[PDB]
Design a protein around this ligand. Structure first.
Ligand code: NAG
Lengths: 48, 30
């Protein structure tokens, strides 16, 4: 519901969506080849 | 038959769903 949206907002008024009470599987999005760049700061993307 | 008191909720942070609670005596402890 976040990555697939009909229309994205302009950068002057960015959206701030709250995600809570759920299990976040980041392997599907990380393995997905559809992203052009995936830059993580702080911790490496595979231990999340 | 209509809704009340929980109007104009600026933003809400939690929702959970369970099966329903309620000659029958009903005791609860909070
Ligand atoms: C709603 O937004 C305010 C920002 O003014 C924030 O303080 C609050 O934690 C948010 N959530 C709820 C349930 O009010």
């Amino acid at each position: 519901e976040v990555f697939n949206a009909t229309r994205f907002a302009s950068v002057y008024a960015w959206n701030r969506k709250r995600i809570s009470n759920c299990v976040a599987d980041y392997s599907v999005l990380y393995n997905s080849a559809s992203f052009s760049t995936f830059k993580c700061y702080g911790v490496s993307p595979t231990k999340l | 038959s209509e809704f009340r008191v929980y109007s104009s909720a600026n933003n809400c942070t939690f929702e959970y769903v369970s099966q329903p609670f309620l000659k029958n005596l009903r005791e609860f402890v909070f």
